[PDB]
Curated annotation (Swiss-Prot), chain A:
Pfam families: DNA_circ_N. LysM-like fold region might interact with peptidoglycan to facilitate DNA ejection. Residues 396-445 are annotated as: LysM-like. The gene is N. Induction: Expressed in the late phase of the viral replicative cycle. Expression of late genes is activated by the viral late transcription activator C. It is found in: Virion; Host cytoplasm. This is DNA circularization protein N. Required for tail assembly of phage Mu and responsible for circularizing the viral DNA after it has been ejected into the host cell. Following infection, the circularized DNA can be isolated as a supercoiled, non-covalent protein-DNA complex, in which the protein N is bound to the ends of the DNA. Protects linear double-stranded DNA of viral genome from host exonuclease degradation. Disruption phenotype: No tail is synthesized. Keywords: DNA end degradation evasion by virus, DNA-binding, Host cytoplasm, Host-virus interaction, Inhibition of host innate immune response by virus, Late protein, Viral genome circularization, Viral immunoevasion, Viral release from host cell, Viral tail assembly, Virion, Virus entry into host cell. One of its GO terms (biological process) is viral tail assembly.
UniProtKB/Swiss-Prot annotation, chain B:
It is found in: Virion; Host cytoplasm. Residues 103-115 have a biased composition (Basic and acidic residues). Forms the central cylindrical hub of the baseplate and plays an important role in baseplate and tail assembly. Core component of the initiator complex that triggers the tail tube polymerization during tail assembly. Forms a conduit that probably functions as an extension of the tail tube allowing viral DNA release during ejection. Might facilitate the interaction of the virus with the host cell surface through electrostatic interactions during virus entry into host cell. Heterotrimer of one uncleaved (42 kDa) and two cleaved (40 kDa) forms. Forms a hub-like structure with an inner diameter of 25 Angstroms through which DNA can presumably pass during infection. Part of a complex composed of three DNA circularization protein N, three baseplate hub protein gp44 and three sub-complex wedge (made of two copies of each baseplate protein gp46, gp47 and gp48) that forms the baseplate. Disruption phenotype: No tail is synthesized. Residues 91-115 are annotated as: Disordered. The chain holds residues 254 to 377 of 379 of the full protein. This is Baseplate hub protein gp44. Induction: Expressed in the late phase of the viral replicative cycle. Expression of late genes is activated by the viral late transcription activator C. Cleavage of the C-terminus gives rise to a shorter 40 kDa form.
Curated annotation (Swiss-Prot), chains C, D:
It is found in: Virion; Host cytoplasm. This is Baseplate protein gp46. It comes from Escherichia phage Mu (Bacteriophage Mu). Part of a complex composed of three DNA circularization protein N, three baseplate hub protein gp44 and three sub-complex wedge (made of two copies of each baseplate protein gp46, gp47 and gp48) that forms the baseplate. Component of the baseplate. Probable connector between the central and peripheral parts of the baseplate. Probably involved in tail assembly. It holds the Pfam family GP46. Induction: Expressed in the late phase of the viral replicative cycle. Expression of late genes is activated by the viral late transcription activator C. One of its GO terms (biological process) is viral tail assembly. Disruption phenotype: No tail is synthesized.
Length: 446, 115, 143, 143
């Protein structure tokens, strides 16, 4: 029995039932040229339509059912259309009719046209994971500085406690100055070096001022961070953290005081946490730089021509800056050897995660709560950025090879566009692209 | 104003009038260029509109507008003006050792001048 | 790699395997969750119970998609062709999201009445070439 | 004047002649290359093999046109008119790039079944008034 319904109001199918919809095409016809064509643009909605009839042997139940159908078709919202041909769909009505003939006492004829209830936004907001790392790093650094300022206790004596606190502060300053000096082979670091020298020369009056000491150190670290570009930041921060760590493990008679053990331990810890957070931010930026450089906007089936200028990439001589579109990597610089391949990104992500987890577990005992609560979210954001932008790329597949093929042939067999043949070799980690290993799994991007 | 400054502005005015007088406009099909990058201003293109009896050979793009309408599709309306209208009064469109060296370092801009 | 749902005695609970719970990374868990969890009934639909409570999940308004299927509307039905068609339609609309995504290519589902008192559905999904070989099992009874 | 392809034992290769390789400046090499090199199969085509690799050339994305012909889709066919029609269409599509230019005037290709187990293709072109005399050879066997 043909018992299609709209809103649990029964109706009988009759006459014709149809579905129409295709792609939107734009016709491109050139003057004084013959070969033309069209271009694709999405797909238009599926405009369903049907013709239904309601009749009975009473001429009053027919009127009641017809009125129910009118008031159910003319209702606000979307209803479950059930049709023997369409199926079970959710549609919004567009227009309908109710035709009788004043001679047929029982028959009432309807003709409905419906549209799918597809409600999707145009902008389609997503999350910007690249820009969520610096925002969290700023809060983590601020919380660490506040914790150091709060937990620092002034010692007033001139004994082993005071001299040992002096040694710890001057050692931290020495490490920072050594990092800046190693940087300064190319970059000009005169101002930061002079500020560090003056700050070291004035320790006695710092260890007694807690807030000034914490800032004096956070400002130095911020200056070190601002010195580096996207090329050496990861290397420099890697070094300062290794060094600050070799420390926090030599700490974890002399003094005979507890307000020293605590000051030294909190100082060493805060230094470790700040260095590792800056390392995480630098890694997040290095990923963007590497992905930007590993991008080739060619992606077309053209024929090579005898183009004299710029035999290899670059730009034509004499072209201004207005002609070239800037990319995100250049816009932020105002690449490392590790962030190129895939196994390397995996190892880097694992190392960052382990280091930050250890820092959190240690922080849960000095600088108790706020630092750990901020650092866990920072770790989540950093690892999410790394995994979502480096490995979980769009259309990445894994294939094996029956024999060792050149990278171009291997790429063409799997995707059909051989121009991005360097990307496959770089991401796999091959030295010579002509010999891509056979039995080993190969990541092919599409 | 001095004499050299006077000629500089007088030429600037002449070249701006030259640029504003002659205008080419075209509607190409693709946002991307032939090489693959986007269409942007300040580019020297070679015009070969000989079928319409037009004797211009080289022009400089002056305005690029990209469109994504539904009735249009992907289009970019590119406007062209002669290059000789956007030059500085020193240079020209194609008396001593100093002049020769300046001419060489002007023909080759990617080189570093002596300054 | 998530926990596997194992059907024992007509209900599916998680189970152990050696040290930790047995894991599974395939379409089996996705299908058995998208098919046998009650999603919210519409405003016009009638309910098998005499109650007015529509099932669902509190987090349905958090996950951009209704969770499961409406096969709970056929809790009490008699052997008539209508039920066979409605079950086919409900299963298709519940499993359509896989085909809207790229995880399955085609979905052919048919309904039948087996040995008296049996509602039988045959669902055939066409997995793409890159799809890992899915898990397979049979519901078991004990005690 | 490029190298000529000489057919021996059902496969083609370049050959020597006196000092260096024999040359050819005609339509013979162009036809024997445009007909007997496998171009990329479409997404929806069903390959004769049980595999899922579409033969092509890494330079297909560097040479402005697909290289060869789709006659390799008929590696294993039975004696039915559908295969003959498909072979005729595939040869027409492979060689139409010549008629698009001015190198040939018309093309007439027919498919037939000669002595049992023979897929006979008769392709007759119409060279224009100025075209050079094409090369002439027959397939040969040895050993």
């Amino acid at each position: 029995t043909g018992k299609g319904t709209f809103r649990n109001v029964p109706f009988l199918v009759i006459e014709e039932q149809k579905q129409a919809g295709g792609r939107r095409l734009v016709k491109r016809e050139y003057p004084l040229r013959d070969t033309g064509g069209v271009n694709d643009l999405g797909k238009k909605l599926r405009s369903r339509t049907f013709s239904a009839c309601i009749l009975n042997s009473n001429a009053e139940t027919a009127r009641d059912e017809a009125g129910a159908l009118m008031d159910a078709l003319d209702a606000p919202g979307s209803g479950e259309l059930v049709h023997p041909d369409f199926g079970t769909v959710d549609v919004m009505v567009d227009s309908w009719e109710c035709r009788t003939k004043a001679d047929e006492l029982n028959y009432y004829a309807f003709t409905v046209t419906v549209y799918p209830s597809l409600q999707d936004t145009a902008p389609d907001a997503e999350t910007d994971t690249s820009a969520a790392v610096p925002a969290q790093a700023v809060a983590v650094t601020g919380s660490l500085g506040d914790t150091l300022s709060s937990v620092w206790q002034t010692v007033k004596d001139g004994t082993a406690a005071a001299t040992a606190v002096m040694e710890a502060v001057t050692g931290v300053i020495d490490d920072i100055s050594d990092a800046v000096d190693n940087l300064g082979v190319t970059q000009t670091v005169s101002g930061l070096m002079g500020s560090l020298s003056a700050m070291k020369g004035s320790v006695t009056s710092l260890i007694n001022q807690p807030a000034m000491l914490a800032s004096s150190l956070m400002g130095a670290l911020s200056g070190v961070s601002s010195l580096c570009d996207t090329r050496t930041a990861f290397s420099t921060w890697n070094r300062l953290a290794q060094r600050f760590e070799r420390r926090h493990a030599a700490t974890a008679t002399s003094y005979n005081s507890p307000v020293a053990e605590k000051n030294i331990a909190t100082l060493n810890y805060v230094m470790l946490a700040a260095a590792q957070t800056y390392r995480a931010e630098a890694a997040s930026q290095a990923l963007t730089a590497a992905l930007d450089f590993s991008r080739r906007m060619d992606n077309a089936a053209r024929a090579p021509v005898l183009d004299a200028p710029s035999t290899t990439t670059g730009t034509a001589s004499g072209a201004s800056s207005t002609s070239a579109t800037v990319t995100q990597g250049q816009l932020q610089l105002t690449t490392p050897p590790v962030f190129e391949s895939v196994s390397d990104i995996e190892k880097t992500t694992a190392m960052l995660g382990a280091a930050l987890d250890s820092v959190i577990l240690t922080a849960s005992e000095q600088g108790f709560s706020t630092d750990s609560v901020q650092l866990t979210q920072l770790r989540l954001l950093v690892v999410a950025d790394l995994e979502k932008r480096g490995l979980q790329l769009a259309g990445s597949e894994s294939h094996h090879l029956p024999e060792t093929l050149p990278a171009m042939v291997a790429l063409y067999r799997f995707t059909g566009n051989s121009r991005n043949w360097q990307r496959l070799a770089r991401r796999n980690g091959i030295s010579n692209p002509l010999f891509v290993p056979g039995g080993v799994s190969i990541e092919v991007i599409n | 104003i001095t004499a050299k400054d006077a000629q500089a502005r007088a030429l600037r005015e002449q070249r701006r009038r030259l640029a504003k007088s002659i205008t080419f406009e075209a509607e190409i099909d693709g946002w991307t260029r032939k090489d693959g990058q986007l269409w942007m201003p300040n580019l020297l293109v070679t015009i070969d509109a000989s079928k319409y009896a037009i004797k211009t050979t080289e022009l400089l793009v002056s305005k690029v507008t990209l469109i994504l309408n539904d009735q249009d599709g992907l289009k970019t309306r590119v406007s062209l003006a002669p290059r000789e209208g956007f030059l500085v009064p020193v240079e020209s469109d194609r008396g001593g050792i100093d002049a020769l060296v300046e001419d060489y370092y002007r023909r080759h801009p990617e080189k570093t001048p002596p300054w | 790699t998530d926990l596997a749902i194992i059907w024992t005695n007509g209900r599916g609970d998680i189970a152990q395997d050696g040290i930790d719970m047995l894991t599974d990374d395939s379409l089996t868990t996705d299908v058995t969750i998208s098919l046998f969890t009650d999603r919210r009934a519409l405003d016009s639909d009638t309910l098998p119970d005499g109650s007015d409570d529509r099932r669902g999940w509190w987090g349905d308004s958090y996950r951009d998609r209704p969770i499961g299927s409406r096969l709970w509307l056929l809790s009490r039905e008699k052997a008539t062709p209508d039920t066979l068609e409605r079950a086919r339609g409900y299963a298709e609309e519940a499993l359509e999201w896989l085909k809207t995504a790229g995880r399955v290519s085609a979905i052919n589902v048919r309904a039948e009445q087996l040995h008296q008192g049996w509602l039988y559905l045959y669902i055939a999904l066409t997995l793409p070439d890159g799809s890992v070989i899915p898990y397979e099992f049979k519901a078991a009874f004990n005690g």
